[PDB]
Amino acid sequence: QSVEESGGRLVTPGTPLTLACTVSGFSLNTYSMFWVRQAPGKGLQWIGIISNFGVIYYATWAKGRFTISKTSTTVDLKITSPTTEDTATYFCVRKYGSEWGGDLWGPGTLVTVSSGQPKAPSVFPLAPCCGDTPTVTLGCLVKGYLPEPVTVTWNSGTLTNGVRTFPSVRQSSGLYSLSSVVSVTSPVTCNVAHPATNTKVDKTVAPSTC
Amino acid sequence: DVVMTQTPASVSEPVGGTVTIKCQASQSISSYLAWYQQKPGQRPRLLIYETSTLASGVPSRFKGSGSGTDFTLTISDLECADAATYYCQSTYENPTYVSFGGGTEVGVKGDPVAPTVLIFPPSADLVATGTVTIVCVANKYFPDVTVTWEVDGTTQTTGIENSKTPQNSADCTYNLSSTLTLTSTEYNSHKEYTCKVTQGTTSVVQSFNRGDC
């Protein structure tokens, strides 16, 4: 029924890491699973596959770089010796019966390979200039973080209507930045979680810059 | 190994129009080809497998055809909801044959909509960091905009970074953030800050004065 990847994190080149794909609602005794990755802003790339009987095949480029395995609840992907170019979102995918294609995909887990150290985001409130006459859009600027992602919620996730969280952009420093804005009928709090640094910051945004 | 060559790299068609996407296989893969749709920031979704068989729930407007080394996805009655990158995949049962095409970024052309614009002066504590970031937002617009920043009437050429949301699923519109970054010394040396959002010869501006905010 569903697939969820975990274990994406920031590592230095040469540091082994393993990703887990946890399945629910079906058995790996029955279904084969495969791994696909997607470098930021790039296309899909097939890594390899493990049958319901445990027989594994790898893409030619992937041979010796990855090891696929399975447990009672998961398939796993060990990246033997990560390089900067292994920075990607990794997806696990349930194979449908008739071909080596996939019907059920996970959300993906993001691997970052870099010599830069992790950095918690700094958060700043966004509001109209002091005194603007109003429906109001308020926001939070979330900057200087590594790795992606941050999770931005409003009012502890209870506010989801009228929210726009722009895609992050990576600066030359390797750090990321984004803003999230919410439109409300004329207080809102942004919550900025960064699983990597286990930090969560809350900012209750004044309705103007006064 | 099999290489899938997908063309075009990108295409835009009007609502109600037709998008034709092709994949060429470097070796015959018989009928073993699938198509996926991937919306920005989301996971890939299976549309078609076995060249032509629709995944459940996937509308008939999506039509897969071809065989051997030549394959086609045709998307009819194009909807704003269809804005996505589409990928073919050889699904042939041999690891030397499996691979994805390079994708086709499909934009959907809906009704023109002029942006509104919001500007966000930097907070006192932001200025206090030594690095000022000014945020501008272009709301609910189509087609693309270009953004410029003016500081006391002078067009800025550095420190500008833009980020665009996916096309709205119902009306095709975009939203964009544009951010201008300067040192607090640079910031404090100027008065009027203007974000200018342009579509052709028509621009919408928002401005503030540093001392007012």
To 5 degrees, how large is the angle CA A70–CA A72–CA A78? 25
Give the Å distances, CA to CA, from B199 to A114, B39, B109, B146. 39, 25, 15, 7
Which residues in B lie closer than 8 A to residue A100 (C-beta atoms)? 32, 91-93, 98
End-to-end CA distance of chain A: 51
Which residues in A lie closer than 8 A to residue B38 (C-beta atoms)? 44
Which residues in B lie closer than 8 A to residue A91 (C-beta atoms)? 43-44
**Which residue stretches of A3-129 are H helix?**
none
Probe site for chain A from B46, B177, B195 (most A CB atoms < 10 A): B177
Measure in Å the smallest separation between the Cα of B162 and chain A Cα atoms.
Answer: 8
List phi, psi (to 5°) of B162: -115, 150
- Count CA within 13 A, CB hemisphere, residue B75: 29
Task: Please report the sign of the dihedral spanned by the C-alpha atoms of residue B22, residue B25, residue B29, residue B34.
Answer: negative
Question: Are B95 and A125 within 8 A, CB to CB?
Answer: no
Task: Please report the sign of the dihedral spanned by the C-alpha atoms of residue A48, residue A103, residue B107, residue A177.
Answer: negative
- Regarding the domain with residue range B111-210, which homologous superfamily does it belong to in the CATH classification? Immunoglobulins (2.60.40.10)
What does the radius of gyration of chain B's CA atoms come to, in whole angstroms?
A: 23
For B37-61, letters b (16+ CB in 10 Å) and e give bbbeeebbbbbbbbbbebbeeeeee
Across the strands, what pairs with B90? B33, B99
The structure was resolved to a resolution in Å of 1.5
Instruction: Closest CB to B87: pick one of A44, A127, A164.
Output: A44
Pick the CATH number of B1-110 from 2.60.40.10, 3.40.640.10, 1.10.10.10, 2.102.10.10: 2.60.40.10
Structural domains of chain A in order of their starting residue, each with its CATH number = 1-115 (2.60.40.10), 116-210 (2.60.40.10)
CB contact, 8 Å: B45 with chain A?
Answer: yes
Measure in Å the smallest separation between the Cα of B143 and chain A Cα atoms.
Answer: 18
Which residues in B lie closer than 8 A to residue A99 (C-beta atoms)? 32, 34, 49-50, 91-93
CB contact, 8 Å: B100 with chain A?
Answer: yes
Probe site for chain B from A99, A142, A151, A177 (most B CB atoms < 10 A): A99
In whole angstroms, give the CA distance from residue A22 to residue B50.
27
Which residues in A lie closer than 8 A to residue B212 (C-beta atoms)? 129-131
Cα A78 from chain centroid?
18
Which residues in A lie closer than 8 A to residue B118 (C-beta atoms)? 128, 137, 181
Way it was determined: X-ray
Which residues in B lie closer than 8 A to residue A48 (C-beta atoms)? 95
Question: And the tokens for A194?
Answer: 């960064």
Q: What is the DSSP string of B86-132?
A: EEEEE--SSTTT-EE---EEEEEE---BPPEEEEEPPPHHHHTTTEE
Question: Are A98 and B49 within 8 A, CB to CB?
Answer: yes
CB contact, 8 Å: B184 with chain A?
Answer: no
In whole angstroms, give the CA distance from residue B197 to residue B129.
28
Q: Which amino acid belongs to residue B98?
A: V
CB contact, 8 Å: B30 with chain A?
Answer: no
- Give the residue from chain B lying closest to A143, CA to CA: B133
Beta pairing class for B10-14 and B104-109: parallel
